[PDB]
Amino acid sequence: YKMSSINADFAFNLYRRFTVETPDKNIFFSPVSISAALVMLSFGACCSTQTEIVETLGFNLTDTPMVEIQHGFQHLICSLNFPKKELELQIGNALFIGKHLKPLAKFLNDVKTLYETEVFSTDFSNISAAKQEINSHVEMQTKGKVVGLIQDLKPNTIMVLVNYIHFKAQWANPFDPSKTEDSSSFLIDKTTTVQVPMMHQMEQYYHLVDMELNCTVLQMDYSKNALALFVLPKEGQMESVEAAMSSKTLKKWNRLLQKGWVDLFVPKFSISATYDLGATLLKMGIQHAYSENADFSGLTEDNGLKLSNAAHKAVLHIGEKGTEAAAVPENTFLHPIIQIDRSFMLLILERSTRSILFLGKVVNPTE
Numbered sequence: 191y192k193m194s195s196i197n198a199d200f201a202f203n204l205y206r207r208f209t210v211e212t213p214d215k216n217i218f219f220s221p222v223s224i225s226a227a228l229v230m231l232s233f234g235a236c237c238s239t240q241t242e243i244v245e246t247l248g249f250n251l252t253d254t255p256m257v258e259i260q261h262g263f264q265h266l267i268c269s270l271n272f273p274k275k276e277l278e279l280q281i282g283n284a285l286f287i288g289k290h291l292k293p294l295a296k297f298l299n300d301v302k303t304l305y306e307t308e309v310f311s312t313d314f315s316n317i318s319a320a321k322q323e324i325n326s327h328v329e330m331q332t333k334g335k336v337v338g339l340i341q342d343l344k345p346n347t348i349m350v351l352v353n354y355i356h357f358k359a360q361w362a363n364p365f366d367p368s369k370t371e372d373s374s375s376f377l378i379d380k381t382t383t384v385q386v387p388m389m390h391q392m393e394q395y396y397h398l399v400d401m402e403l404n405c406t407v408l409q410m411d412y413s414k415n416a417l418a419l420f421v422l423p424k425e426g427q428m429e430s431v432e433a434a435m436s437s438k439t440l441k442k443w444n445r446l447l448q449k450g451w452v453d454l455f456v457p458k459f460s461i462s463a464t465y466d467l468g469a470t471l472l473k474m475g476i477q478h479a480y481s482e483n484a485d486f487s488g489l490t491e492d493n494g495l496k497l498s499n500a501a502h503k504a505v506l507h508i509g510e511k512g513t514e515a516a517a518v519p520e521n522t523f524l525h526p527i528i529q530i531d532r533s534f535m536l537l538i539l540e541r542s543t544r545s546i547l548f549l550g551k552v553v554n555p556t557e
């Protein structure tokens with residue numbers, strides 16, 4: 191439906207902003223975790239403070255009113271977090287608000303019930319302790335994956351917004367670790383290579399050669415409800431492919447991907463990136479939230495509350511097993527070969543709601 195479509199466009203707009211902030215470097219975030227976190231924040235906001243968030247998120251208030259957007263994200267969060275057999279998936283977020291400001295009981299229950307949101311009362315006069323509280327909550331929620339989310343914290347800080355995702359899944363076709371090459375050449379520039387181990391399997395994969403956008407798209411299924419999309423642009427075409435990415439593009443690929451026997455070569459690697467979302471969201475329209483003129487009346491009765499920081503970090507491993515620790519010890523040329531040896535874009539999607547669990551660019555897979 192339309193919400194999936196509107197969230198994917200946000201994902202690619204948010205992605206592009208990151209390409210101007212940090213050009214020619216790795217990008218990695220959970221757009222759905224961000225999109226859901228902002229709506230949640232919005233719930234406690236009033237007037238133009240609230241209005242701005244939903245419009246930066248990509249929604250039109252004439253098309254769909256605020257209550258419908260809430261009920262939609264209500265349903266999206268609930269369906270995602272629903273424990274499905276062979277998949278661990280949790281999209282969550284928290285708030286850390288200065289002890290002197292009392293959040294409303296209605297708001298508290300509403301966000302825990304409808305948005306999977308815990309709200310914490312934190313003392314920000316001890317920026318050291320305050321950091322350790324926050325980081326440990328994300329470290330706890332993500333089962334040790336996302337460590338040390340927040341490095342910097344101003345003495346001013348009044349409210350800190352944190353969003354995250356927990357993801358654990360197996361490949362539908364797991365790789366043979368014995369078939370993994372120890373050191374393969376991987377292009378990052380046009381005049382730099384790095385040694386990345388290269389996993390090797392020949393199996394049936396969905397793929398496409400896009401003649402219009404000048405890239406190869408490969409789909410690798412997880413066993414339950416999730417898939418990876420590897421987008422490999424021809425040389426010099428990385429940025430034009432970045433311009434191309436939209437909801438309209440995915441719909442195209444969904445219609446056109448074909449299954450066949452492929453000699454597949456995929457790098458074994460871990461990617462992580464950490465963001466303070468403020469600089470880009472400020473550019474993208476969310477003003478009044480960070481402002482001294484913030485209206486968060488739905489959240490608290492008493493005065494002086496506003497958003498200090500929105501912080502998010504995404505971590506993902508690509509291994510032989512799936513999204514899990516490897517630690518594993520140690521025929522023909524008439525198959526069409528797909529070899530991911532250059533810098534590529536990467537998408538992790540969830541099937542039933544068409545959400546983007548992860549998006550990013552891998553420029554260099556060795557941190």
Ligand SMILES: N[C@@H](Cc1cc(I)c(Oc2cc(I)c(O)c(I)c2)c(I)c1)C(=O)O
Nearest residue numbers: 194195198437440441443444539540541544
């Ligand atoms: N063909 C298979 C595999 C597949 C699933 C998804 I999820 C996807 O990504 C999107 C994202 C958005 I946003 C859409 O509106 C659509 I349509 C597809 C693509 I590409 C392929 C399937 O359908 O399960």
